[PDB]
Amino acid sequence: GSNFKAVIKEVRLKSEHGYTNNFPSGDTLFIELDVEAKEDLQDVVAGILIRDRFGQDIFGINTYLMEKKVELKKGKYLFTFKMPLNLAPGKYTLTVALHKGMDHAQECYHWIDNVCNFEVNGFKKEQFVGVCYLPTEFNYRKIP
């Protein structure tokens, strides 16, 4: 798998208030990845994958799907992902990867399964049931 022509040196989870692995549902999650390219690299893809305790994919995406071109010159980089964490309360794992190609069939630079364990606790927005939260609006009107 990993050939380490690029390496993920460290992964940090952050809220808008500071570094933490504990988030209320709906809070903004920043994923910071310290990356070092040992050589020049073209067509680099970075991917994240959030899974639950039973290995089920909760949400995964990479920069090929987001349409984001990444080119690395030999040296150091900070990669950042940002997303509202609209998930049910629970315990989750984060997997990260640097590869080539949409489904890493072309080349594998560095894959780290379950690099971070984090958890969602409580609700930042409305309380809700189910695996995820959809921002919802409501109105009603009397009709003659």
Add this chain to the structure above:
Amino acid sequence: GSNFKAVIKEVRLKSEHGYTNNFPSGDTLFIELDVEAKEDLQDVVAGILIRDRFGQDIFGINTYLMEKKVELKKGKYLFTFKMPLNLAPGKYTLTVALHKGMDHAQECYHWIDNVCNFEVNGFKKEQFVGVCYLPTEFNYRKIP
């Protein structure tokens, strides 16, 4: 269960373009409920619950959790919910309810299991994996 002091007479699903039961992932879903109150009712709560093809709770919420007060005089009403359908492609069901109290322990007016079948097909935005879609931002930068 239901005592039918208020009755959901019909439930319809909507996009911003018209009535439909087929949505690309990320499209805005409107849920219309035709409601009949046969008598005056106070402290009414309206709830929706999206489940997947295996009976799993995907997302549910009600107007008590949204802190949206509802009072019904004898007559006819149109209830509308609106939400981004940030879900994986697949087949889903909608369950609806009118009751009293946050968790319907107080009174049950009308509960309809799987009132509508709908499905998410394709991606209005980025393609993704997992049960749900979290709107994500990416950036990278060299660091000394």
